[PDB]
Amino acid sequence: ATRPLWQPGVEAPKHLDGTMPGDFGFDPLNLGVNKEALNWYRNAELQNGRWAMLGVAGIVIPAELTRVGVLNVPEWAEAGKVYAESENAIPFASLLMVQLFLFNFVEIKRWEDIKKPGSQAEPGSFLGFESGFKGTGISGYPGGAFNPFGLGNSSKEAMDDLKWREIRNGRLAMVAFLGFLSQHAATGKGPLDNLADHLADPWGANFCSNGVSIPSALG
């Protein structure tokens, strides 16, 4: 309740109490006044954050490893075409349909979790594997077969701490991925290319010089 907030001096809305991990009282648009909608948004934020952490890793780590001289993989934007032109490449349509067919199963399972957070643990569901889907009382944190190392599986407040670390890193990753998308749309260079470019001339090479951010019509 007395926790630090996004704006020091502005009190948190009386619906963003202080229980959810990553709660800084940030909600200027009042999108989470409904409790059920707030749970769905929490679950959506978890999914977006986890996919963005995976994606931003798979963008920067190959990029930085290419820069130093290893693996020499393409830059993330053209990586789709680089594979697509390969000889024994799966066609795009068939590849996308394979991916969507697998994710259909997985994501409908996670969905039926989100409704009743013990839904998929009923006996007779899978072939003895249904026990690993019991959940942990909160949607978005399955545990069981997930979390093999049992990290935070000890002191409760330890799990609460790791939850804040996860959510902060995920928020950073999503902001960074929006940055990657907007930077490649503007400057057709990579993320590390933009980084090493800005440090060269911070007052000359920025977002007010690429000519795509600030509309050329105005200036």
Ligand X SMILES: CC1=C(/C=C/C(C)=C/C=C/C(C)=C/C=C/C=C(C)/C=C/C=C(C)/C=C/C2=C(C)C[C@H](O)CC2(C)C)C(C)(C)C[C@H](O)C1
Long-range contacts, 207-213 (Cβ 8 Å, 24+): 210/186, 212/185, 212/186, 212/187, 213/186
Report in angstroms how near the CB of residue 153 gets to ligand X at its nearest. Answer: 45
Stretch that binds ligand X, among 26-34, 37-45, 178-186, 203-211 (CB under 6 A): 203-211
Of the candidates 119, 125, 136, 213, which one interacts with ligand CHL according to CB under 6 A? 136
Rounded to an integer, what distance in angstroms lies between the CA atom of residue 13 and that of residue 10?
9
For residue 81, CA distances in Å to 69, 75, 183 come to: 22, 11, 19
Rounded to an integer, what distance in angstroms lies between the CA atom of residue 170 and that of residue 51?
9
Task: Annotate each residue in 146-175 with x if it binds ligand CLA (CB under 6 A) or - if it does not, as one string.
Answer: ------------------------------
Rounded to an integer, what distance in angstroms lies between the CA atom of residue 83 and that of residue 74?
10
Would you report the helix, strand and coil content of the chain in percent, each value rounded to 5?
50, 0, 50
Residue 16 interacting entry, from ligand CLA, ligand X, ligand CHL, none, C-beta within 5 to 8 Å by type: none
For residue 37, CA distances in Å to 10, 93, 114, 147 come to: 23, 34, 12, 27
Of the candidates 53, 59, 63, 174, which one interacts with ligand CHL according to CB under 6 A? 53
Stretch that binds ligand CLA, among 14-22, 37-45, 69-77, 178-186 (CB under 6 A): 69-77
104 binds ligand X (CB under 6 A): no
184 binds ligand CHL (CB under 6 A): no
Query: Residues in the site for ligand CHL, rule: CB under 6 A?
Result: 50, 53-54, 57, 61, 136, 141-143, 146-147, 151-152, 159, 162-163, 165-166, 169
Query: Residues in the site for ligand CLA, rule: CB under 6 A?
Result: 54-55, 57-58, 61-62, 71, 73-74, 79-80, 82-83
